[model samples]
Target: LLYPKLNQLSNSINAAVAFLLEARNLEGWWQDFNFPQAASIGDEWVTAYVGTMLATLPYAHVHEALMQAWELLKIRDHRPTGEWGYNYILCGDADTTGWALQLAAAVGASDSERAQQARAALATHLQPNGGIATFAEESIRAFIVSFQGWCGAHTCVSAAVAALPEFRSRLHDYLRVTQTSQGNWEGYWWSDHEYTTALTAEALAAGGQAADQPSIEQAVAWGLKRLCPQGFVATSKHPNGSTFATAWCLRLLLLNTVDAEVKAARAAAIGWLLEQQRPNGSWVSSAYLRIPYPFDRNPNQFPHWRYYDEIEGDKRFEGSIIFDHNSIFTTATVVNSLVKAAPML
Candidate 1:
């Protein structure tokens, strides 16, 4: 059966999946450790996001965890706007709403009232630029005006919603316009352009399908360009490379394209990722989310990073939330990446 070994993640995928289930608490929730904010400590958003990802695998053991996540996820709607938030008590945000809709789609709850309402509500946040804003509504603005961040449509949040079928029509041009001369986009919350590129490219490839060939092909070129001879990728401006970006790149390449060169890159990336896996079956943690303040940017400015090239020299590496206390978040992400790669391998 196709050699029955090298072509499979076989053991690596199994260990990660087993570790994820074991990491869950009795209530079926998983949380980060270092973030000590009393209100954000529960970390419900990451818990639901990770569980929703696990549900995508073709396995039965993850069902119990899925049910527990669905219990919380099902009731997380913000009503009136039908959007979701960073936390249970926070206001609606496009990034969270987009991911929540993805979970609803995954669990076969797309037709549910809350999901349908979320679908209708997302359109309100789509900007004239064709990208979705993190929080652009009149009401949402009132809640966030205290901070200078969230001024315009963001690359990451736009990429997340663009992966959905219903939101496909209006998103392509936004990505096309925002793409840097180097074939990447500057994400607002993340410090890495590699992470931004993977998600952006995957969104276009997965949702736009063959129709986005001209645009998606550009990202495919950038993906390979970033691969080092050592078989990994780092965000454009990092001194130390990241395990998180490597797997994110691998997942992007696995789904969006395949050929001799790309296939070889996937192999090297996977080899490096596996070697970095800890004895406990988890992957190393790296920062993902960042706080609004601290970066040397103008809070009074409307459009941050007005041009793409500016991001190359931009500095926002510190104060990152990382959000994966025990690196469980890292394992969940890589597990999804490895599962995507297993069959392809």
Candidate 2:
């Protein structure tokens, strides 16, 4: 009750974010964003937070910041490999690239080389089976490839890939039966809520599912109810809060908000996100990478500043600092978030 009156966000949620931001900015941000290290690259879900933010929020300063971010993205290595490294922080094929491609497709990439690159990445890497493999590892068994939120990502990418009938079949194959009796679908590796709901709505909308579809509506309702005054918690009722999940919920609500609750959630989330931006023009993360990439990297790997002393430098200011593994998931998430902030800017 007191939460809703305090700057429209809960004090508890702010306390956690504040503690996280103050403790270690880069690692905190990375903890919030990184993934896809051991897994395959080209997972669009990795960058979903940023993309959704770009499409939803409406702050001029933030939008301008996003444009700057898009400028940076347009200048970077937008390739498809199972690993993702931000500049030189870490290197591997990337799931975030899938998201980058999705963004490219959305913002007038038709007939251009970059668009073609985005298209090819989608074609060759997204796979033809019921799920998306994290990376193209031949030795990795089929089911292992579909573990965790990889399948959830498949659902999000479904709408983007629907232009081609063959890809649509694969999308349907994966998404068709994931729904539960409550109209919400389960995420891979037992993940649920916004991760599942956002991806589901994204895929459905992409594939011509009507905006008013029942399952989609129920998922959005579930997703929105979880939005607290401060930020969206991972669960609708649980006090456990998260920037990552908040981003997902905000993004999802932005996509699904013809209704009051979703609209309110979107507004509150945007308010919260506006408050969380770092001085260096990036958003911070405050949780473990839901799906850590590079399953093999030392779990304590801190990619943003190899030696920790580098934090004093200006170059380190550009990306979200990740400390869990030797992967670019966190920085890429920052990049994606920046890009997501673009359209809304």
Candidate 3:
């Protein structure tokens, strides 16, 4: 019983939850035949996403697996800087360390004490600007470099942790000051409208801001105007961006679109997204000149997407990848962004 307007969102939630649930049953093993099968043994990135998703969805079924994934992060004794990265890496790095500790703390998932120690260590990396950095050198460059690895990953996890009664006041100032005239930060790896918007919305939501900020207002306006009558493009300028990217952008914009024009744009973009799904309740990357199936995509598809064939002018064309088929990271991000918007949707 999905509503007409929310069909894309409903499908996104259903497919993501279903797929992630199946992956959890396999102990955080993802990469099905429809998905490119990557190295399965110790991808901490997958586990982080899985644990986060489990926390978000309303399922009583996989509580144990969710707990198991969090517990797995606990066994290797970790300090603040000693958690996360390379999946099973024992010493815990800052980026995943944030995910590990935050998830454990928020959901009571596992390893409470170790997770706490890890968080204390990780907190050392938080900058005055609320941006987090990765490597700590104590040098001036290290100070200038806001690693923001895990915080840059998705906003809600850490933001949620910040919102709890104990952490509310400290995190409030952090979240408050981070909003720029742009209403988004220059994120660590990439800083598109979706990346910045999604992260900002999640962090603000986590901080529980009931009032409007200039940057947030500007961001919503920017995100909404970027929408075409059909769907969103990657940038406001890139008219024919991938459906995958479009959905992510729309989801992000809808997160904070409190104004009238922005609200209309959100509705139009959602309609555009609903128009892009496959009949079988799944979505595929555009696959324009590539092999037909998703699993058939080249193995080196992770860092950058090269899904289509090397046909002349193909790479330059718009909408090369579908949103769901981008990367595990992108898929997880899209899911997180949607989860953030779900309440308002």
Candidate 4:
């Protein structure tokens, strides 16, 4: 907070935290308003995601909110022998469950019964390629046929799981090989590869992959070029203010502090991010995450995909898009990027 840039970013982070803190529900949960109760499921999925990401920032105020958020996460934990669910109103899935476990670890509850049960369930969700699934491996049939239907080997999901010591050893290669030749990874739920690649890079770094490895090397270069002169990274789905992609790419660049190109590009990217944040400290709400869609992967292994045909273009379903309508999801990610950039700046 001493330097000017760090001080500015700290203030940005503080403003975002204040927005998120005030945005929290009286019940201690953060509701994801993705669809006016539309395509998005219940609250716990986003609460785990928001709180889990927020738990990593080093601010004292954030720590306090995380404690409150953790209460809600724990309340949603006893998932009928399952764990956290993407649709909290529905069933548990690997994506939300893995993040909930990480959230537990973040808040100093890693050894609690909640984390213990979550880890046990997570063990049952692993796939053959060292990646994790959208739903439990055993429930792929039920998940795809009658439920969310996104049971691919989501590297984003696996990357979150791999950040932990229990799963990192097995996930390294899955993550490594899954890095698309275009320098990104596929996000089954999100429309853009930036989300997948950004999370993938962070997880690889957190999982102890050497920075020189192909994934990080290509990913950093890939994300570096994604910044607009205006500093936002969009899915090109919209003209401007695609805040979600900006944070994801910015957070990835922050991982490589030694890169001169990263520093150069982030100057504008960070500026765009700070400018886009509303006075209320939230970014514009845009839901770029797709629903029930799996990427047409090159080295595909998901048996339930729509087609093994090449993923030719950006395909979207209007009724099934996802994100926090109130901007909490975008806000959490933007703050996360700023906090990471703050210290390095």
Q: Tell me the TM-score of each prediction against the true structure.
A: 0.83, 0.53, 0.64, 0.85
- Model 4, 1-345: lDDT tens digits are 247766677778888888988987768677775433333535777787888778868778777777777787777755665587765555678877877777877889889887888888877777776778777535544443233245556777877777677877777788888777888787666655677787778777776646536678788888887776678775545667478888888887877778877887777788888777788888887645554533333222333333211234653342244556678887888887777666565
Sequence-dependent TM-score of model 2: 0.53
TM-score of 1: 0.83
lDDT of model number 2: 0.44
- Quantify how close model 1 is to the true structure by its C-alpha RMSD in Å: 5.5
lDDT of 2 by residue, 1-345 (tens): 233434333332333333323433231222223323333322233332343234333445434433433434455554343223233233322244445454544444444565455445555455545655444443223323232233224433343344333355556656656565666554422123455566666666666755336666777777766777665565432345555567666556656545766666665665666566554434443423223332322222323322222345443311223332322333233333323422332
**Arranged by TM-score, best first:** 4, 1, 3, 2
Among the numbered candidates, top TM-score falls to 4
State the lDDT at 53 in candidate 2: 35
Q: Could you tell which candidate, 1 or 3, scores higher by lDDT?
A: 1
Name the weakest run of 10 consecutive residues (lDDT summed) in model 3: 287-296
Q: Please, what's the RMSD in Å of model 2? A: 10.3
Pairs of residues clashing in candidate 4? 33-325, 35-38
Candidate 4 overall Cα lDDT vs. reference? Answer: 0.71
lDDT of 3 by residue, 118-183 (tens): 667756655555544443544213322232332232233334344334444555565556555745
Residue 339, candidate 1: how far off, in angstroms? 0.8
Please list the C-alpha lDDT of all candidates, in the order they appear: 0.68, 0.44, 0.48, 0.71
Report RMSD (Å) for each prediction in the order shown.
Answer: 5.5, 10.3, 8.7, 5.3
- If both were scored by lDDT, which would come out higher, candidate 1 or candidate 2? 1
